[PDB]
Amino acid sequence: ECSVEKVDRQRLLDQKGCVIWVTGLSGSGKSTLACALNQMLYQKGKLCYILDGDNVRHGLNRDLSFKAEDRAENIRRVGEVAKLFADAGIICIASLISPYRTDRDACRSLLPEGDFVEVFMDVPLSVCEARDPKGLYKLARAGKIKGFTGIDDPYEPPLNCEISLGREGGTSPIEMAEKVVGYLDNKGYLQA
Amino acid sequence: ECSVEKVDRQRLLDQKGCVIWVTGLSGSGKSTLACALNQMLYQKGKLCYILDGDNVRHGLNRDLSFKAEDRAENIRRVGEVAKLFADAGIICIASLISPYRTDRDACRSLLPEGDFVEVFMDVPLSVCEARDPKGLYKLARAGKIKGFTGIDDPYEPPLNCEISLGREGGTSPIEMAEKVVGYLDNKGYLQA
Numbered sequence: 075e076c077s078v079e080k081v082d083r084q085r086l087l088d089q090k091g092c093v094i095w096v097t098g099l100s101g102s103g104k105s106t107l108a109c110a111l112n113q114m115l116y117q118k119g120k121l122c123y124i125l126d127g128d129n130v131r132h133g134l135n136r137d138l139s140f141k142a143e144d145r146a147e148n149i150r151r152v153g154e155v156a157k158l159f160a161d162a163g164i165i166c167i168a169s170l171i172s173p174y175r176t177d178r179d180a181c182r183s184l185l186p187e188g189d190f191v192e193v194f195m196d197v198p199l200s201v202c203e204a205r206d207p208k209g210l211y212k213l214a215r216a217g218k219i220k221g222f223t224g225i226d227d228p229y230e231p232p233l234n235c236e237i238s239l240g241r242e243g244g245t246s247p248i249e250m251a252e253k254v255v256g257y258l259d260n261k262g263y264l265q266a
Numbered sequence: 267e268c269s270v271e272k273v274d275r276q277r278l279l280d281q282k283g284c285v286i287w288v289t290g291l292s293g294s295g296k297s298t299l300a301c302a303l304n305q306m307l308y309q310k311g312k313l314c315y316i317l318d319g320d321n322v323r324h325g326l327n328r329d330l331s332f333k334a335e336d337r338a339e340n341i342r343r344v345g346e347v348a349k350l351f352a353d354a355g356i357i358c359i360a361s362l363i364s365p366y367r368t369d370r371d372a373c374r375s376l377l378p379e380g381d382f383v384e385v386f387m388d389v390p391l392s393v394c395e396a397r398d399p400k401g402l403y404k405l406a407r408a409g410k411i412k413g414f415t416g417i418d419d420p421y422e423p424p425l426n427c428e429i430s431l432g433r434e435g436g437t438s439p440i441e442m443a444e445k446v447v448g449y450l451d452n453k454g455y456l457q458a
């Protein structure tokens with residue numbers, strides 16, 4: 075143990091470290107929400123870092139597939155990394171499909187109460203598939219991708235998340251980010 | 267890709283993200299060097315974070331043993347995590363025995379040239395064993411620990427590290443940290 079503590083890092087950054095865990099089907103707007111939130115927090119002088127499922131999967135998790143056991147390990151490792159970022163005082167935004175409740179719950183358990191903010195992109199499959207920005211649903215339908223979440227692999231929504239976004243429609247990435255920032259501000263995470 | 271870039275995070279923190287990779291036998295002073303450096307950088311208003319072999323091994327790497335293949339994975343994952351910290355703009359201090367050259371070299375390869383500073387605690391086994399602060403060498407001699415680095419498992423020193431510390435003796439953790447801080451300062455890593 076070193077003399078420099080988490081509260082020292084928070085004092086330096088004037089914010090509190092935490093994990094914003096963004097979960098949802100492909101196409102539910104996780105990544106655009108993460109980017110909008112990051113931009114908004116940056117402009118307020120707060121330091122964020124995004125752990126994106128796809129990106130981490132080309133580095134730390136390059137060894138993992140999409141078999142259920144590998145998704146569990148993917149989520150577990152991201153959870154541990156996010157905890158480290160939080161301990162460093164960073165507002166860490168994890169954005170992964172993260173389809174299994176038990177695995178997201180395990181990530182929550184790694185952190186002190188209040189430090190893990192589960193954010194659900196509450197968007198139905200039909201809307202996600204109509205967007206299909208990356209053509210993944212198209213690929214899954216054409217049979218190229220087996221066991222695609224929402225098609226032939228399960229997504230289990232959060233039963234008690236802190237924030238639920240996107241259900242209404244005609245709500246923008248920026249408006250949704252504003253809701254998250256408002257929540258963080260009220261919970262006291264935006265000042266030491 | 268989000269609009270907020272690494273240079274934006276560096277601008278916010280007034281420093282450059284990097285990996286300070288501290289390697290050496292058990293008892294060579296890695297952890298006291300890491301703590302002294304962290305304290306010193308904190309007092310200068312710079313944000314550091316220490317990834318310590320033992321600690322990470324109770325979380326992210328809780329699944330790994332000390333078999334050579336598991337040490338390789340331990341090092342590989344820490345290298346990827348340290349890269350993320352560097353990308354976040356943090357001065358990331360990795361402090362692991364990290365005994366194999368090929369594995370440390372692989373971590374170096376993950377980063378742009380200049381962003382990985384390999385620091386060797388150049389302290390002979392005999393001095394490390396005389397210190398034996400945690401009683402590990404005692405345990406290895408008594409046979410409790412098989413394949414202990416330096417005893418019955420190999421340590422391969424860096425052939426071309428940026429900084430080599432501790433060989434003289436009567437050099438303190440703080441004096442050694444000062445040398446590292448001087449190097450970082452001169453390389454420009456302590457300002458945006």
Ligand SMILES: Nc1ncnc2c1ncn2[C@@H]1O[C@H](COP(=O)(O)OS(=O)(=O)O)[C@@H](O)[C@H]1O
Binds near residue numbers: 210222
């Ligand atoms: N079978 C699949 N299901 C979902 N995503 C997949 C699949 N195969 C490849 N991918 C890709 O992997 C990305 C999702 O990765 P993650 O967010 O990390 O998933 S997770 O389920 O393990 O949390 C998708 O954007 C997509 O690009």
Ligand SMILES: Nc1ncnc2c1ncn2[C@@H]1O[C@H](COP(=O)(O)OS(=O)(=O)O)[C@@H](O)[C@H]1O
Binds near residue numbers: 319336361
């Ligand atoms: N066989 C071993 N060799 C070295 N360290 C061990 C061994 N077994 C347990 N340990 C513990 O693990 C710590 C070292 O872990 P690491 O720094 O992560 O090692 S590394 O070789 O894989 O990089 C030691 O401080 C010690 O507490």
